[PDB]
Design a protein around this ligand. Sequence first.
Ligand SMILES: CC/C(C)=C\Cc1cccc(O)c1O
Length: 248
Amino acid sequence: FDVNLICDFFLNTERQGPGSPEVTLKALSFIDNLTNKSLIADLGCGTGGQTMILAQHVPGKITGIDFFPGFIERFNKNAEKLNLQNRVKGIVGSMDDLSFEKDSLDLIWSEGAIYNIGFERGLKEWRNYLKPGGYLAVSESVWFTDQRPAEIHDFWMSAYTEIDTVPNKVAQIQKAGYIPVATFILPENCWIEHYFAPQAKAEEIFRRKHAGSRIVEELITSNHHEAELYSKYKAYYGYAFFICKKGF
Ligand SMILES: CC/C(C)=C\Cc1cccc(O)c1O
């Protein structure tokens, strides 16, 4: 239950990281090679929230993959409420131990999840599953400037060491063999209105239900710390969307 308790929390939240419906569609506005015969993959799909948004604005089949059964379960449940389970199926797997036929995907999606496998690594390894001239759309943590207060910098150095500046993320994408077709930083309501805000609302009902659990206490204490650091340093970092096209 140590792991499930955390998954259980996010099932009562909008998303697990910065993002919003408008941003997912804006990122999508840059993919122009989709058709009924397209094969799309959402890696680290989570509860599939942004997956349903795609499946409603683009033709083709979508396969969500995520490490936690609990998320994949809700993912399919929701997929069924929208009568989409026919072209949108959830599956439990790992971003590194994938089994996609080489050069079979037209689009690889992944919002706030590539940090698990690593930015550069994802680029390198995921490129193999994309058809030549395919699209990889990911949102990642970025530095807005080359200089940051010690506090916010050390914080990221303790969580995600690969957080870099946009120039460097873009450089890597090209080095990996893609063309940086579209890159943009997420707006702030992607952190407040659609993430931290709805998160807080749940923190209350949730904490009482599992009163005493140190796991849930640690979590809530982290959330507030994160939301706090963002209001105090939101001018030094954020989330950016990278739409990369396979080259060669
Ligand atoms: C499960 C604990 C860990 C693997 C994930 C925590 C985490 C790390 C980096 C960025 C994220 O937004 C995020 O929620």
